[PDB]
Chain length 109, copies 3
């Protein structure tokens, strides 16, 4: 099992949720976060002066899936979150050793 | 070392904190998140019409513990967070390779 | 690749960001969280009476880096976040198996 961790543009959350749902991936954890990547935020022109915003509002989407489902989950997120501009997002894959459903106590290892 | 990541009902946080404390597990990180599981949220009846809420407020509890302590931490969370209804929570176990205490610089590997 | 996860005092975020930037580590994810460590929060005296605050506001800094860069990232965070008092923070290192840039689709494994 793996956890797919995507940090996307907040306005792309609905697109991502729908692309994952259509593929049968419904379970996910969503966190409001802030971040920046390799461009260290954005430079804007305001009243003829350059202004820097080095930390932007982002949405973190965490999806725990089977090892074989990772590539598909990554493809679903890329296809629905992509705009072609800096800041589209990063996806990180982290190993998950155990998964427990609290209600039933069932544990997948 | 492992990180035990529990996503629980927000109203169960105090129960979970107390169950972990009684067992000597005090250190934890708590994040307000949103999510859904296999039932894709909830269906409610409002003014004679069916309404869907597909992302619910949840509380993420992260507890870094020794490898041998995992099962106990998982049991403590299940016993205190469980209601017997859909949405009680999921628990994921993730490997932690290093743990550093900033104040002292001590690092456990 | 590894994810360096630091839980620091909120007032140290700017120091940490600058120390990481000076070393060329710009990409990071920042989350507002709450937590406590081994001292189980703080005890304050208010109106001649002892009061306990068992969960404090903290800032989680997540930095995905190459395996060889971990130690430096940990040193940068320790040097800029340290005050010498309980609550300076914890740093956890978690393995990252894949990293994808959404815009380009490039994947580092
Ligand atoms: N090395 C990193 N460690 C942790 N989080 C990161 C890292 N890089 C980026 N992120 C997170 O991913 C979000 C999206 O990053 P972004 O899409 O700008 O990545 P990028 O590498 O700069 O690619 P691009 O050139 O397409 O912008 C960031 O705002 C931050 O929350
Ligand atoms: N596959 C998953 N990936 C990431 N987070 C998940 C996943 N499944 C559930 N979660 C998180 O766990 C929270 C609790 O999920 P929930 O208890 O409903 O799980 P479940 O598998 O549907 O079990 P149940 O049938 O008892 O409801 C969700 O709201 C979401 O934040
Ligand atoms: N075992 C743990 N599991 C998960 N998060 C933890 C753990 N211990 C501490 N944290 C997080 O790290 C933050 C900082 O912890 P803190 O610096 O107080 O650690 P400590 O072990 O008590 O060291 P110190 O004695 O210097 O205070 C906490 O508020 C919490 O968010
Ligand atoms: O995140 C954005 O929307 C633009 C900024 C960016 O790409 C970055 O900081 O790397
Ligand atoms: O989370 C809940 O409280 C009910 C919804 C649920 O179980 C789910 O979406 O899987
Ligand atoms: O976090 C603090 O600022 C003081 C409390 C502390 O160190 C703890 O709970 O372990
Ligand atoms: Mg970028
Ligand atoms: Mg459910
Ligand atoms: Mg402490």
């Amino acid at each position: 099992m793996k956890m797919v961790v995507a940090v996307i543009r907040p306005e792309k959350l609905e697109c991502v949720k729908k692309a994952l749902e259509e593929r049968g991936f419904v379970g996910m954890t969503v966190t409001e976060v802030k971040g920046r990547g390799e461009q260290k935020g954005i430079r804007l022109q305001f009243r003829g002066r350059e202004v820097e915003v080095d930390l932007l509002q982002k949405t973190k989407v965490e999806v725990v899936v089977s090892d074989d489902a990772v590539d598909e989950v990554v493809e679903a997120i890329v296809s629905s979150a992509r705009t072609g501009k800096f800041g589209d997002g990063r996806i990180f894959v982290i190993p998950v050793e155990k998964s427990v459903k609290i209600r039933t106590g069932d544990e997948e290892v």
